[PDB]
Design a protein around this ligand. Structure first.
Ligand SMILES: CS(=O)(=O)Cc1cccc(Nc2nccc(Oc3ccc(NC(=O)C4(C(=O)Nc5ccc(F)cc5)CC4)cc3F)n2)c1
Length: 290
């Protein structure tokens, strides 16, 4: 029971271009992927016009009483419609119902988020595999940067992994508190992934995404260790300003660590572009047999 008339008409227009009729979507309410303060995600089945069943994730708000929340929720989904790249999560559509929250419907990602995948001891990715995941993230980010899209929360916890081990850059947005909320510090900011200038100004750019990408590479090379295990409540800005960076992981190749240090250049202007990152990491990846 949202009132579409109260929303920005341009937003409603965009939503209608990706509408899923409620009868085409079955939400498995008993099968919850996650729950947070603002939202929740369920398994779902989407029927296409030919009757083919598609396994999907279905994201919902917990409340629909605040127009800002409803508008932001729909806007987050609509933003994704503008993305078409193998390493960027795509939108299946948005289901508007006569009762309750609109539903944002995403393709199902078998292996969940990249951080949970690499931390899972039942999986055994090689150093080459892990570098490959990093390369895929860089390609997704190269695409997004070309669209002048600034991510603001790039981290392994926000990237998804499908059944073919394709990494999809994503962002849980309003449902980000479902998992790993403790990495957010009071604005809720992912301080251990943020560039020095962003810690100081709370402004983000593609060059600050590059810093976060460096941290993501470190996550990959440590199979999902928390960054800066030396610091919990100690101010990360002060820590960095003492002249410190994350240490080189034991199995991180020297040139990949050099890439990380470049991503953390004190001058944003001097950090490599995602184009440069894709080129450099492709070369490093290519040196591994397995
Ligand atoms: C992640 S986990 O390991 O902790 C839990 C788990 C375990 C096993 C399987 C899964 N499968 C799964 N498949 C598809 C989606 C999904 O959850 C979502 C993953 C991402 C989102 N994304 C979004 O809501 C948005 C988004 O991703 N935007 C966005 C922003 C920038 C981009 F570059 C791309 C997309 C619109 C805000 C929404 C979701 F419901 N979850 C999930």
């Amino acid at each position: 029971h949202i009132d579409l008339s109260a929303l920005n008409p341009e937003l409603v227009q965009a939503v209608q271009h990706v509408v899923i009729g409620p009868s085409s979507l079955i939400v498995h309410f008993n099968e919850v992927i996650g729950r947070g303060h603002f939202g929740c995600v369920y398994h779902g089945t989407l029927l296409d016009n030919d009757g083919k069943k598609i396994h999907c994730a279905v994201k919902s708000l917990n409340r629909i009483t605040d127009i800002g929340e409803v508008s932001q929720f729909l806007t987050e989904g609509i933003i994704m419609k503008d993305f078409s790249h193998p390493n960027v999560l795509s939108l299946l559509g948005i289901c508007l119902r006569s009762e309750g929250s609109p539903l944002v419907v995403l393709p199902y990602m078998k292996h969940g988020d990249l951080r949970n995948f690499i931390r899972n001891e039942t999986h055994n990715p090689t150093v080459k595999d892990l570098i490959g995941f990093g390369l895929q993230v860089a390609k997704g980010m190269k695409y997004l940067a070309s669209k002048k899209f600034v991510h603001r929360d790039l981290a392994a916890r926000n990237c998804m992994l499908d059944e073919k081990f394709t990494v999809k850059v994503a962002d849980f947005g309003l449902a980000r508190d479902m998992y790993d909320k403790e990495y957010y510090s009071v604005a809720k900011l992912p301080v251990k992934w943020m560039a020095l200038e962003s810690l100081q100004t709370q402004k983000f750019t593609t060059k600050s995404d590059v810093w976060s990408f460096g941290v993501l590479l470190w996550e990959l090379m440590t199979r999902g260790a928390p960054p800066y295990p030396d610091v919990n409540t100690f101010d990360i800005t002060v820590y960095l300003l003492q002249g410190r960076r994350l240490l080189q992981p034991e199995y991180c190749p020297d040139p990949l660590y050099e890439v990380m240090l470049k991503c953390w250049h004190p001058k944003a202007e001097m950090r490599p572009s995602f184009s440069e990152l894709v080129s450099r990491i492709s070369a490093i990846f290519s040196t591994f047999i397995g």
